[PDB]
Design an enzyme around this catalytic site. Structure first.
Site, PDB file in Angstrom:
ATOM      1  N   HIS A  62       0.820  -1.201   0.000  1.00 11.99           N
ATOM      2  CA  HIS A  62       0.000   0.000   0.000  1.00 11.99           C
ATOM      3  C   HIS A  62       0.856   1.254   0.000  1.00 11.99           C
ATOM      4  N   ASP A  92       8.043  19.150 -28.533  1.00 11.84           N
ATOM      5  CA  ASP A  92       8.095  17.814 -27.966  1.00 11.84           C
ATOM      6  C   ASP A  92       9.385  17.743 -27.173  1.00 11.84           C
ATOM      7  N   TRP A 127       7.705   0.381   4.711  1.00 13.17           N
ATOM      8  CA  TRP A 127       8.099   1.008   3.456  1.00 13.17           C
ATOM      9  C   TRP A 127       9.512   1.553   3.532  1.00 13.17           C
ATOM     10  N   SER A 157      13.208   5.648 -13.384  1.00 11.78           N
ATOM     11  CA  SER A 157      12.163   6.428 -14.044  1.00 11.78           C
ATOM     12  C   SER A 157      12.116   7.861 -13.531  1.00 11.78           C
ATOM     13  N   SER A 158      12.184   8.035 -12.208  1.00 13.54           N
ATOM     14  CA  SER A 158      12.132   9.371 -11.628  1.00 13.54           C
ATOM     15  C   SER A 158      13.349  10.201 -12.013  1.00 13.54           C
ATOM     16  N   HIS A 241      13.028  12.692   3.079  1.00 11.95           N
ATOM     17  CA  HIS A 241      12.268  13.933   3.211  1.00 11.95           C
ATOM     18  C   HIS A 241      12.279  14.774   1.928  1.00 11.95           C
ATOM     19  N   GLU A 243      12.012  13.394  -0.832  1.00 13.91           N
ATOM     20  CA  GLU A 243      10.964  12.682  -1.552  1.00 13.91           C
ATOM     21  C   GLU A 243       9.576  13.205  -1.213  1.00 13.91           C
ATOM     22  N   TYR A 245       8.804  16.147  -0.131  1.00 13.50           N
ATOM     23  CA  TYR A 245       8.632  17.466  -0.731  1.00 13.50           C
ATOM     24  C   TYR A 245       8.472  17.380  -2.245  1.00 13.50           C
ATOM     25  N   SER A 256      -2.015  26.620  -7.398  1.00 14.57           N
ATOM     26  CA  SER A 256      -1.878  27.994  -7.875  1.00 14.57           C
ATOM     27  C   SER A 256      -2.677  28.220  -9.141  1.00 14.57           C
ATOM     28  N   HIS A 290      14.949  14.588  10.989  1.00 13.70           N
ATOM     29  CA  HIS A 290      13.872  14.680  11.956  1.00 13.70           C
ATOM     30  C   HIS A 290      13.111  13.371  12.047  1.00 13.70           C
ATOM     31  N   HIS A 291      13.278  12.491  11.061  1.00 11.46           N
ATOM     32  CA  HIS A 291      12.633  11.192  11.101  1.00 11.46           C
ATOM     33  C   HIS A 291      13.307  10.228  12.056  1.00 11.46           C
ATOM     34  N   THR A 316       6.263  27.655   3.343  1.00 13.09           N
ATOM     35  CA  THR A 316       4.972  27.020   3.120  1.00 13.09           C
ATOM     36  C   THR A 316       3.848  27.897   3.645  1.00 13.09           C
ATOM     37  N   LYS A 319       3.355  30.479   0.930  1.00 10.96           N
ATOM     38  CA  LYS A 319       2.541  29.906  -0.139  1.00 10.96           C
ATOM     39  C   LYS A 319       1.072  29.800   0.257  1.00 10.96           C
ATOM     40  N   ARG A 438       2.806   2.062  15.869  1.00 14.17           N
ATOM     41  CA  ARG A 438       2.583   1.965  14.438  1.00 14.17           C
ATOM     42  C   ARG A 438       2.910   0.571  13.919  1.00 14.17           C
TER      43      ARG A 438
HETATM   44  C1  HEA Z   1       0.513   8.481  -1.427  1.00 14.07           C
HETATM   45  C2  HEA Z   1       0.400   8.538  -0.120  1.00 14.07           C
HETATM   46  C3  HEA Z   1      -0.651   7.798   0.603  1.00 14.07           C
HETATM   47  C4  HEA Z   1      -2.094   7.912   0.461  1.00 14.07           C
HETATM   48  C5  HEA Z   1      -2.915   8.767  -0.446  1.00 14.07           C
HETATM   49  C6  HEA Z   1      -2.565   6.931   1.455  1.00 14.07           C
HETATM   50  C7  HEA Z   1      -4.002   6.716   1.642  1.00 14.07           C
HETATM   51  C8  HEA Z   1      -4.636   5.758   2.549  1.00 14.07           C
HETATM   52  N1  HEA Z   1      -3.912   4.979   3.378  1.00 14.07           N
HETATM   53 FE1  HEA Z   1      -1.833   4.843   3.648  1.00 14.07          FE
HETATM   54  N2  HEA Z   1       0.251   4.827   3.912  1.00 14.07           N
HETATM   55  C9  HEA Z   1       1.184   5.494   3.218  1.00 14.07           C
HETATM   56  C10 HEA Z   1       0.872   6.377   2.096  1.00 14.07           C
HETATM   57  C11 HEA Z   1      -0.460   6.800   1.663  1.00 14.07           C
HETATM   58  N3  HEA Z   1      -1.605   6.290   2.152  1.00 14.07           N
HETATM   59  C12 HEA Z   1       2.576   5.283   3.649  1.00 14.07           C
HETATM   60  C13 HEA Z   1       3.825   5.886   3.096  1.00 14.07           C
HETATM   61  C14 HEA Z   1       2.450   4.354   4.765  1.00 14.07           C
HETATM   62  C15 HEA Z   1       3.572   3.830   5.626  1.00 14.07           C
HETATM   63  C16 HEA Z   1       3.733   2.333   5.783  1.00 14.07           C
HETATM   64  C17 HEA Z   1       4.648   2.138   6.960  1.00 14.07           C
HETATM   65  O1  HEA Z   1       4.689   3.029   7.833  1.00 14.07           O
HETATM   66  O2  HEA Z   1       5.341   1.106   7.020  1.00 14.07           O
HETATM   67  C18 HEA Z   1       0.986   4.173   4.826  1.00 14.07           C
HETATM   68  C19 HEA Z   1       0.363   3.304   5.802  1.00 14.07           C
HETATM   69  C20 HEA Z   1      -1.062   3.270   6.032  1.00 14.07           C
HETATM   70  C21 HEA Z   1      -1.612   3.076   7.383  1.00 14.07           C
HETATM   71  C22 HEA Z   1      -0.862   2.912   8.671  1.00 14.07           C
HETATM   72  C23 HEA Z   1      -0.934   1.430   9.003  1.00 14.07           C
HETATM   73  C24 HEA Z   1       0.127   1.066   9.992  1.00 14.07           C
HETATM   74  O3  HEA Z   1       1.312   1.287   9.685  1.00 14.07           O
HETATM   75  O4  HEA Z   1      -0.227   0.553  11.070  1.00 14.07           O
HETATM   76  C25 HEA Z   1      -3.052   3.066   7.154  1.00 14.07           C
HETATM   77  C26 HEA Z   1      -4.052   2.921   8.229  1.00 14.07           C
HETATM   78  O5  HEA Z   1      -5.242   2.878   8.005  1.00 14.07           O
HETATM   79  C27 HEA Z   1      -3.266   3.292   5.710  1.00 14.07           C
HETATM   80  C28 HEA Z   1      -4.547   3.303   5.024  1.00 14.07           C
HETATM   81  C29 HEA Z   1      -4.860   4.297   4.023  1.00 14.07           C
HETATM   82  C30 HEA Z   1      -6.243   4.571   3.646  1.00 14.07           C
HETATM   83  C31 HEA Z   1      -7.488   3.946   4.164  1.00 14.07           C
HETATM   84  C32 HEA Z   1      -6.111   5.576   2.622  1.00 14.07           C
HETATM   85  C33 HEA Z   1      -7.258   6.221   1.957  1.00 14.07           C
HETATM   86  O6  HEA Z   1      -7.041   7.637   1.892  1.00 14.07           O
HETATM   87  C34 HEA Z   1      -7.572   5.672   0.585  1.00 14.07           C
HETATM   88  C35 HEA Z   1      -8.501   6.683  -0.062  1.00 14.07           C
HETATM   89  C36 HEA Z   1      -7.705   7.298  -1.174  1.00 14.07           C
HETATM   90  C37 HEA Z   1      -8.160   7.371  -2.417  1.00 14.07           C
HETATM   91  C38 HEA Z   1      -9.530   6.858  -2.753  1.00 14.07           C
HETATM   92  C39 HEA Z   1      -7.244   7.993  -3.439  1.00 14.07           C
HETATM   93  C40 HEA Z   1      -7.936   8.186  -4.772  1.00 14.07           C
HETATM   94  C41 HEA Z   1      -7.493   7.096  -5.702  1.00 14.07           C
HETATM   95  C42 HEA Z   1      -6.812   7.371  -6.809  1.00 14.07           C
HETATM   96  C43 HEA Z   1      -6.412   6.241  -7.702  1.00 14.07           C
HETATM   97  C44 HEA Z   1      -6.456   8.788  -7.174  1.00 14.07           C
HETATM   98  C45 HEA Z   1      -7.251   9.078  -8.431  1.00 14.07           C
HETATM   99  C46 HEA Z   1      -6.939  10.434  -9.008  1.00 14.07           C
HETATM  100  C47 HEA Z   1      -6.285  10.555 -10.163  1.00 14.07           C
HETATM  101  C48 HEA Z   1      -5.811   9.347 -10.904  1.00 14.07           C
HETATM  102  C49 HEA Z   1      -6.011  11.912 -10.719  1.00 14.07           C
HETATM  103  N4  HEA Z   1      -2.030   3.365   4.941  1.00 14.07           N
HETATM  104  C1  HEA Z   2       3.188  15.228   1.608  1.00 12.40           C
HETATM  105  C2  HEA Z   2       4.429  15.083   2.016  1.00 12.40           C
HETATM  106  C3  HEA Z   2       4.848  15.626   3.325  1.00 12.40           C
HETATM  107  C4  HEA Z   2       4.917  17.034   3.663  1.00 12.40           C
HETATM  108  C5  HEA Z   2       4.607  18.244   2.836  1.00 12.40           C
HETATM  109  C6  HEA Z   2       5.364  16.955   5.062  1.00 12.40           C
HETATM  110  C7  HEA Z   2       5.567  18.189   5.796  1.00 12.40           C
HETATM  111  C8  HEA Z   2       6.121  18.358   7.126  1.00 12.40           C
HETATM  112  N1  HEA Z   2       6.407  17.317   7.925  1.00 12.40           N
HETATM  113 FE1  HEA Z   2       6.192  15.263   7.520  1.00 12.40          FE
HETATM  114  N2  HEA Z   2       6.069  13.232   7.006  1.00 12.40           N
HETATM  115  C9  HEA Z   2       5.743  12.677   5.826  1.00 12.40           C
HETATM  116  C10 HEA Z   2       5.351  13.458   4.649  1.00 12.40           C
HETATM  117  C11 HEA Z   2       5.263  14.915   4.555  1.00 12.40           C
HETATM  118  N3  HEA Z   2       5.567  15.735   5.579  1.00 12.40           N
HETATM  119  C12 HEA Z   2       5.805  11.198   5.768  1.00 12.40           C
HETATM  120  C13 HEA Z   2       5.453  10.295   4.623  1.00 12.40           C
HETATM  121  C14 HEA Z   2       6.198  10.846   7.126  1.00 12.40           C
HETATM  122  C15 HEA Z   2       6.388   9.499   7.759  1.00 12.40           C
HETATM  123  C16 HEA Z   2       7.598   8.804   7.198  1.00 12.40           C
HETATM  124  C17 HEA Z   2       7.736   7.468   7.861  1.00 12.40           C
HETATM  125  O1  HEA Z   2       7.482   7.390   9.077  1.00 12.40           O
HETATM  126  O2  HEA Z   2       8.084   6.497   7.165  1.00 12.40           O
HETATM  127  C18 HEA Z   2       6.342  12.163   7.761  1.00 12.40           C
HETATM  128  C19 HEA Z   2       6.727  12.284   9.154  1.00 12.40           C
HETATM  129  C20 HEA Z   2       7.226  13.523   9.709  1.00 12.40           C
HETATM  130  C21 HEA Z   2       8.228  13.533  10.785  1.00 12.40           C
HETATM  131  C22 HEA Z   2       8.946  12.371  11.394  1.00 12.40           C
HETATM  132  C23 HEA Z   2       8.278  12.059  12.717  1.00 12.40           C
HETATM  133  C24 HEA Z   2       8.668  10.668  13.116  1.00 12.40           C
HETATM  134  O3  HEA Z   2       8.839   9.814  12.228  1.00 12.40           O
HETATM  135  O4  HEA Z   2       8.795  10.415  14.326  1.00 12.40           O
HETATM  136  C25 HEA Z   2       8.380  14.954  11.084  1.00 12.40           C
HETATM  137  C26 HEA Z   2       9.330  15.484  12.080  1.00 12.40           C
HETATM  138  O5  HEA Z   2       9.765  16.616  12.018  1.00 12.40           O
HETATM  139  C27 HEA Z   2       7.481  15.710  10.184  1.00 12.40           C
HETATM  140  C28 HEA Z   2       7.309  17.161  10.193  1.00 12.40           C
HETATM  141  C29 HEA Z   2       6.885  17.921   9.024  1.00 12.40           C
HETATM  142  C30 HEA Z   2       6.914  19.397   8.987  1.00 12.40           C
HETATM  143  C31 HEA Z   2       7.372  20.388  10.010  1.00 12.40           C
HETATM  144  C32 HEA Z   2       6.384  19.707   7.668  1.00 12.40           C
HETATM  145  C33 HEA Z   2       6.199  21.046   7.071  1.00 12.40           C
HETATM  146  O6  HEA Z   2       6.803  21.079   5.777  1.00 12.40           O
HETATM  147  C34 HEA Z   2       4.736  21.458   6.961  1.00 12.40           C
HETATM  148  C35 HEA Z   2       4.651  22.899   6.473  1.00 12.40           C
HETATM  149  C36 HEA Z   2       3.225  23.403   6.516  1.00 12.40           C
HETATM  150  C37 HEA Z   2       2.786  24.201   7.497  1.00 12.40           C
HETATM  151  C38 HEA Z   2       3.697  24.589   8.611  1.00 12.40           C
HETATM  152  C39 HEA Z   2       1.359  24.685   7.532  1.00 12.40           C
HETATM  153  C40 HEA Z   2       1.097  25.870   6.614  1.00 12.40           C
HETATM  154  C41 HEA Z   2       1.644  27.134   7.223  1.00 12.40           C
HETATM  155  C42 HEA Z   2       0.890  28.035   7.853  1.00 12.40           C
HETATM  156  C43 HEA Z   2      -0.588  27.858   7.985  1.00 12.40           C
HETATM  157  C44 HEA Z   2       1.558  29.262   8.414  1.00 12.40           C
HETATM  158  C45 HEA Z   2       1.479  29.287   9.929  1.00 12.40           C
HETATM  159  C46 HEA Z   2       2.315  28.171  10.504  1.00 12.40           C
HETATM  160  C47 HEA Z   2       3.212  28.389  11.471  1.00 12.40           C
HETATM  161  C48 HEA Z   2       3.444  29.760  12.025  1.00 12.40           C
HETATM  162  C49 HEA Z   2       4.004  27.234  11.997  1.00 12.40           C
HETATM  163  N4  HEA Z   2       6.641  14.822   9.381  1.00 12.40           N
HETATM  164 CU    CU Z   3      10.219  14.504   6.740  1.00 10.65          CU
END
Ligand code: HEA
Ligand code: HEA
Ligand code: CU
Ligand code: PCF
Ligand code: PEF
Ligand code: PEF
Ligand code: PEF
Ligand code: PEF
Ligand code: PEF
Ligand code: PEF
Ligand code: CA
Ligand code: MG
Lengths: 534, 102, 45, 55, 133, 59, 47
Positions: A62, A92, A127, A157-158, A241, A243, A245, A256, A290-291, A316, A319, A438
């Site tokens: 998943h 192209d 993952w 690919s990426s 991280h 990734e 972003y 936008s 931070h992870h 952010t 933005k 988790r």
């Molecule tokens: C792309 C990022 C992404 C998205 C969108 C989701 C969406 C969902 N995820 Fe997940 N998830 C992860 C990335 C994501 N997840 C990652 C990285 C982990 C970590 C595994 C780990 O920690 O080991 C995780 C783990 C994770 C957990 C934590 C389980 C655990 O570790 O104990 C759960 C719990 O319910 C969960 C369930 C779901 C559910 C119910 C949705 C629902 O939101 C599903 C509903 C979403 C849709 C219906 C999307 C629409 C479908 C499309 C096909 C898009 C169509 C649009 C176009 C094609 C333009 N996934």
């Molecule tokens: C969509 C991708 C995405 C984005 C954009 C972010 C954005 C951010 N993430 Fe996250 N993060 C993940 C995807 C993402 N993350 C994933 C997949 C994990 C789990 C990985 C794993 O466990 O395997 C994770 C887990 C993760 C961790 C690790 C925690 C842990 O594993 O124990 C941390 C720690 O710092 C973090 C923090 C943040 C912060 C500070 C931002 C910031 O960039 C957010 C910025 C946005 C705002 C701040 C809000 C908008 C701003 C305002 C409204 C202005 C006012 C705000 C202030 C004055 C503060 N997130």
């Molecule tokens: Cu991060």
């Protein structure tokens, strides 16, 4: 038709193929998510009879499916290869055979991921593929090797698409376009291409070191041998991280555009949006640890990394406030891309604020590997990528398909995925802050209530997806009919409040981007003469 | 650079005097009203003259309808449409509310 | 100058509905699990 | 005549900004001074009773 | 310019019947009204003015809104049908599930509360796990 | 040997795909196609024994 | 190179001129996409 799709060398056919593979794999990732949430409805082994290995395997399937095979192919591949040559007026994209090999190296990554799931035990490592759990002493069999090869093929690919995107938007702009006069989606995919190019080497290095430990008796990560497992955490999160972003910044491009075209006013400080996206892209690579606040880093190291992670809240925020400034004072035409933009704004701000609470290394004591971090990341990933994807689809699909979609069904699909995604991802913060760990297939039975309401929300989200793939069918068979009756929205921009209807009909598309004056489905090679610009 | 109010007035007087067909009258009026200020009544007088010169009634009703949706009170609309009473009587355009009485 | 009612009056009459509507919308959007806990058995009801 | 009426959106923006900051401050003042202070008062009451039964 | 007036048979109630007039009669009415425009605008009759205003700014064609008068109720009823159908499907596949845990009983959870009260866990919060029946 | 002008004439004056325009194209292209078909048929063919558990016999 | 263009020539599949219904292929594609993890669960639980 063998040539046009198999031997393809123009960007739009590659783009619709990228989108088809993306949505196929996204359906599969949603099914794995449904099965995960179904097993996590009530305590005790409900559906998978014991077998926590299969639950972990579906967890990595998943996760890796929704990240590397839905959002990254869809956002990067399909939307980049359709609009990035178009929105700069390029004929192209340069290196189109690299553009074709990136797509065609993706679904075999899907093939070997599926066969990793099918072979002897399956990859049950998360993952993140942390050793020594993913090593050969804990995971025998060829499964994690095939998951590693899936990650390697999608890394190819990426990276190759990133090279293609960089030299396309640098070298092949049209004649009037300076780099400052670019759109925000083109700038967004440019910055994303640079982060891909500078991140995927460290991922390839760490993953190939994992493979070398697994099959060639070497010790990068084996303690019996002197190796250190924290090196994989450093390498994987220096990829990881940047990734996430990479996954969010094309959403910052799409939002936008849909916000400026459904508020009928330009983006507030567009050069500041370019600077903020580039600042987020530069600031990603400095915050990667931070992870891993838990492994026992020094206090000065964590005190650095919490400040570095907190600094990205400022661009952010710039933005997210400039989007509010674009929507303020305009004339909102609430079509479904505008609905997905507004919902993206609110729910991504909520996910970012939980991320800011996660940025502190003293609080990530209390929140690491809880369901609070899955609340944070499913909020930013789910809303900021799926709502961006749905906004991009409902925004550009009438133009790139010539077939209008049913609008009432689009708004019920939006509303259903809105309340369903909220119902699934809001109690995860409660489960996390009360200490639910988790990646568990079973829990103490004090977590069952919020697990029940989230498992109720998953069926709402899957119903909205089934509705969306009905909207696809209804768009593909009745698109011209949808144009001729009143079941859709023909004009994305209404007349202004002085403008006559015939005066509008002579000038029916008023955009700041090229793509909307192209014909429905556009020419197989458009831009014979290059598009001029002042 | 920001324009003062009288500089705005002079510029849109010149623009409405130079407008030559219906696309230009509606364009000048669109980006006349899309600022954060209700235009001076000389500008609306030039707008009604310029809509008369291109022989199009309903944009000269849209002047007053956009003025209604643009001005902040219900009393400043009265102050505008009684200061344009002789111009609207001379051209003979109605308001939209006394055209569709409901 | 200052034709008509003051800006305080004519924007308070727009804002005072919107404060209550925003509080209702956010209290639904944030405080919906209170209904599930309220009807739930863990309140012993 | 008509006095120049200009700048309604600027007054509207600063009014919306300070109303939003005050609304969020009301939310957070409720959060802290009700919820967090209630939990801290319960904990301090328990530790006062604990030291009293330790006497 | 043109003749006396557009007839009431051809111009009256133009809002109700613009979108059902054929495109030729639309074009001919628009042409005759544009010829009537150059006359001094006192001489236009009131159905003529209403027809000209609806032709230029009426809620037809490009000024047609996104949702036309029944669509808001249809999208509310659609999202309610989706919620009820999804929780129905949840009830079905929940009924085709495994047995409950042996610790999901009122009497088991009362004894768990008894043990926790003997250890005086969660002293200012809640320690009772009951949650079931 | 300076075949560049002659090969420019041959390559531009040809209604064949670009990998076929040289006169020596079949000399590469036929064994490459056969070897490619074998090399992508066989590891797909070894997947049922992979998911079944039957490792290769050491004979 | 010069391919055909128009409303349905932009896509790989064939919607209009078709012996079987389009709904067959369009929902079979997403159905096997949705049923790939059920094949995976069946194989792992049989093991
Ligand atoms: C792309 C990022 C992404 C998205 C969108 C989701 C969406 C969902 N995820 Fe997940 N998830 C992860 C990335 C994501 N997840 C990652 C990285 C982990 C970590 C595994 C780990 O920690 O080991 C995780 C783990 C994770 C957990 C934590 C389980 C655990 O570790 O104990 C759960 C719990 O319910 C969960 C369930 C779901 C559910 C119910 C949705 C629902 O939101 C599903 C509903 C979403 C849709 C219906 C999307 C629409 C479908 C499309 C096909 C898009 C169509 C649009 C176009 C094609 C333009 N996934
Ligand atoms: C969509 C991708 C995405 C984005 C954009 C972010 C954005 C951010 N993430 Fe996250 N993060 C993940 C995807 C993402 N993350 C994933 C997949 C994990 C789990 C990985 C794993 O466990 O395997 C994770 C887990 C993760 C961790 C690790 C925690 C842990 O594993 O124990 C941390 C720690 O710092 C973090 C923090 C943040 C912060 C500070 C931002 C910031 O960039 C957010 C910025 C946005 C705002 C701040 C809000 C908008 C701003 C305002 C409204 C202005 C006012 C705000 C202030 C004055 C503060 N997130
Ligand atoms: Cu991060
Ligand atoms: C189509 C109509 C189908 C109607 C089926 C009627 C039967 C029924 O009432 O089911 C109740 C379900 C059972 O769900 P359960 O309590 O988890 O039991 C599952 C089965 N075991 C594990 C015991 C094997 O309990 C539930 O699913 C609770 C319903 C979901 C909650 C909805 C709340 C809505 C609030 C607004
Ligand atoms: C590892 C990936 C290596 C990428 C090198 C790209 C070089 C830059 C470039 O763009 O090289 C240009 C060519 C593509 O050019 P083209 O024919 O598409 O361009 C047409 C206009 N001249 O790259 C390649 O042949 C890459 C060949 C890849 C071989 C398999 C690698 C599998 C691993
Ligand atoms: C910390 C406060 C900011 C937080 C972030 C902002 C909120 C995000 C949403 C913004 C939406 C509106 C943006 C578009 C408006 C626009 O673009 O307006 C453009 C106008 C143009 O003005 P001009 O023609 O005179 O100049 C033309 C040449 N510049 O400039 C303004 O209106 C000025 C507004 C000033 C705002 C001052 C804020 C004072 C309150 C601060 C906080 C106090 C808290 C007190 C609590 C008790
Ligand atoms: C927003 C709309 C959709 C939200 C779905 C909520 C799921 C209900 C649930 O999670 O139901 C769990 C609770 C408690 O049931 P229980 O603890 O006895 O469960 C033991 C096994 N059944 O049932 C209810 O209280 C139903 C009433 C909930 C009211 C929700 C209203 C929201 C507004
Ligand atoms: C933000 C405000 C969220 C309010 C949720 C309402 C809960 C309704 C309910 O269901 O709360 C039920 C519980 C009562 O349960 P009990 O412990 O008495 O049970 C005893 C059974 N024997 O209320 C509370 O504990 C108070 C809840 C306060 C909110 C704390 C929020 C901290 C985590 C933040 C989550 C992420 C926020 C997103 C970013 C801002
Ligand atoms: C569970 C947690 C989440 C709860 C969410 C709220 C609960 C309600 C769920 C939805 C019920 C369906 C109602 C359909 C409404 C309808 O039918 O809309 C029809 C309306 C009116 O149309 P009209 O005036 O043109 O005339 C029609 C009559 N002739 O147009 C609209 O769309 C505008 C209303 C939507 C505004 C945009 C919202 C986008 C998402 C915002 C995300 C949150 C931001 C705010 C945060 C504070
Ligand atoms: C699956 C059942 C097929 C039955 C065929 C029976 C044949 C009898 C004759 C019937 C007529 C001919 C049928 C063949 C034609 C055909 O259907 O296309 C065949 C292909 C695959 O074919 P295959 O190689 O699997 O077929 C084996 C035999 N050759 O299907 C599909 O891509 C289905 C695709 C699903 C639709 C996806 C919808 C989403 C698209 C989004 C695009 C927009 C992007 C916008 C953003 C960039
Ligand atoms: Ca369970
Ligand atoms: Mg951890």
């Amino acid at each position: 038709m063998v040539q046009r799709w198999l031997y393809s060398t123009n960007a739009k056919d590659i783009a619709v193929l990228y989108f088809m593979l993306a949505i196929f794999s996204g359906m599969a990732g949603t099914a794995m998510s449904l099965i995960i949430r179904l097993e996590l409805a009530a305590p005790g082994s409900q559906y998978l009879h014991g077998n926590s290995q299969l639950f972990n395997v579906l967890v990595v399937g998943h996760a890796v499916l929704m990240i590397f095979f839905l959002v990254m192919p869809a956002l990067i591949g399909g939307f980049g290869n359709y609009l990035l040559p178009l929105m700069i007026g390029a004929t192209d994209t340069a290196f189109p055979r690299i553009n074709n090999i990136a797509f065609w190296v993706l679904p075999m990554g899907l093939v070997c991921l599926v066969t990793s799931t099918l072979v002897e035990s399956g990859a049950g490592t998360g993952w993140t593929v942390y050793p020594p759990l993913s090593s050969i002493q804990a995971h025998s069999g060829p499964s994690v090797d095939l998951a590693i090869f899936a990650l390697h093929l999608t890394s190819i690919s990426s990276l190759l698409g990133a090279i293609n995107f960089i030299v396309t938007t640098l070298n092949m702009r049209t004649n009037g376009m300076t780099m400052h006069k670019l759109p925000l989606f083109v700038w967004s995919i440019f910055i994303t291409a640079f982060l891909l190019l500078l991140s995927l080497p460290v991922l390839s290095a760490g993953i190939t070191m994992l493979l070398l430990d697994r099959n060639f008796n070497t010790s990068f990560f084996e303690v019996s041998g002197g190796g250190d497992p924290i090196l994989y955490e450093h390498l994987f999160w220096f990829f990881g991280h940047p990734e996430v972003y990479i996954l969010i910044i094309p959403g910052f491009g799409i939002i936008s555009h849909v916000v400026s075209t459904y508020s009928k006013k330009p983006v507030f400080g567009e050069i500041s949006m370019v600077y903020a996206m580039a600042s987020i892209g530069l600031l990603g690579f400095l915050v990667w640890s931070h992870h891993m606040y838990i492994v026992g880093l020094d206090a000065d190291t964590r005190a650095y990394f919490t400040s570095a992670t907190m600094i990205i809240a400022i661009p952010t925020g710039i933005k997210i406030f400039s989007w509010l400034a674009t929507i303020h004072g305009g004339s909102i035409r609430l079509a479904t891309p505008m609905l997905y933009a507004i919902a993206f704004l609110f729910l991504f701000t909520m996910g970012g604020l939980t991320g800011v609470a996660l940025a502190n290394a003293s609080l990530d004591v209390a929140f690491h590997d809880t369901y609070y971090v899955v609340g944070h990341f499913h909020y930013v990933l789910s809303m900021g990528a799926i709502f961006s994807l749905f906004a991009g689809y409902y925004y550009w699909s009438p133009q790139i398909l010539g077939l209008n979609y049913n609008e009432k069904l689009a708004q019920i699909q939006f509303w259903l995925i809105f309340i369903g995604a909220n119902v699934i991802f809001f109690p995860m913060h409660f489960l996390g802050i009360n200490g639910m760990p988790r990646r568990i297939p079973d829990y103490p039975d004090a977590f069952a209530g919020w697990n029940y309401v989230a498992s109720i929300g998953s069926f709402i989200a899957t119903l909205s997806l089934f509705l969306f793939i009905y909207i696809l069918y209804d768009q593909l068979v009745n698109g011209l009919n949808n144009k001729v009756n009143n079941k859709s929205v023909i004009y994305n921009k209404a007349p202004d409040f002085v403008e006559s209807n015939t005066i509008f009909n002579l000038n029916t598309v008023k955009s700041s981007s090229i793509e909307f004056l192209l014909t429905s489905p556009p020419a197989v090679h458009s831009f014979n003469t290059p598009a001029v610009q002042s | 650079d920001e324009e003062t109010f009288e500089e705005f007035t002079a510029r849109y007087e010149k623009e409405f005097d130079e407008a030559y067909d219906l696309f230009e009258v509606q364009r000048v009026l669109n980006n006349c009203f899309s600022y954060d200020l209700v235009p001076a009544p000389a500008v609306i007088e030039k707008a009604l003259r310029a809509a008369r010169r291109v022989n199009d009634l309903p944009t000269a009703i849209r002047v007053f309808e956009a003025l209604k949706y643009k001005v902040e009170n219900e009393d400043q609309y009265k102050a505008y449409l009684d200061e344009l009473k002789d111009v609207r009587q001379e051209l003979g355009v109605p308001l939209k509310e006394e055209l569709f009485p409901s | 100058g200052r034709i008509g009612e003051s800006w305080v009056i004519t924007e308070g009459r727009r804002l005072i509905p919107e404060i209550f509507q925003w509080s209702a919308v956010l209290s639904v959007c944030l405080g919906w699990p209170g209904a599930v806990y309220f009807f739930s058995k863990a309140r012993k009801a | 005549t008509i006095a120049p009426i200009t700048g309604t959106i600027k007054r509207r923006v600063i009014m919306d900004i300070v109303l939003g900051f005050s609304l969020g401050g009301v939310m957070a003042s409720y959060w802290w001074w009700g919820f967090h202070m209630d939990k801290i008062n319960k904990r301090e009451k328990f530790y006062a009773e604990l030291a009293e039964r330790k006497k | 310019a043109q003749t006396h007036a557009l007839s009431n048979a051809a111009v009256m109630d133009l809002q109700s019947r613009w979108e059902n007039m054929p495109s030729t009669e639309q074009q001919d009415i628009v042409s005759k009204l544009s010829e009537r425009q150059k006359l001094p605008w006192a001489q236009l009759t009131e159905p003529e003015k209403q027809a000209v205003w609806y032709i230029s700014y009426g809620e037809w064609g490009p000024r047609r809104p996104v949702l036309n008068k029944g669509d808001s109720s249809f999208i509310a009823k659609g999202v309610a049908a989706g919620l009820l159908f999804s929780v129905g499907l949840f009830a079905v596949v929940r009924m085709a599930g495994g047995q409950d845990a042996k610790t999901m009983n009122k009497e088991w959870q009362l004894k768990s509360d008894e043990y926790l009260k003997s250890k005086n866990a969660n002293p200012w919060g809640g320690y009772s796990q009951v949650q079931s029946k | 040997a300076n075949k560049v002008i002659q090969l420019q004439k041959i390559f531009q004056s040809s209604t064949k795909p670009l990998w076929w325009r040289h006169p020596r194209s079949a000399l590469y292209l036929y064994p490459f196609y056969a070897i490619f078909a074998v090399a992508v048929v066989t590891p797909l063919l070894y997947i049922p024994n992979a998911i079944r558990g039957i490792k290769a016999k050491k004979a | 190179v010069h391919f055909k263009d128009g409303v349905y020539e932009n896509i790989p599949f064939k919607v209009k001129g078709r012996k079987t219904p389009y709904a067959l292929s369009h929902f079979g594609f997403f159905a096997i996409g949705f049923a790939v993890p059920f094949v995976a669960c069946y194989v792992q639980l049989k093991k």
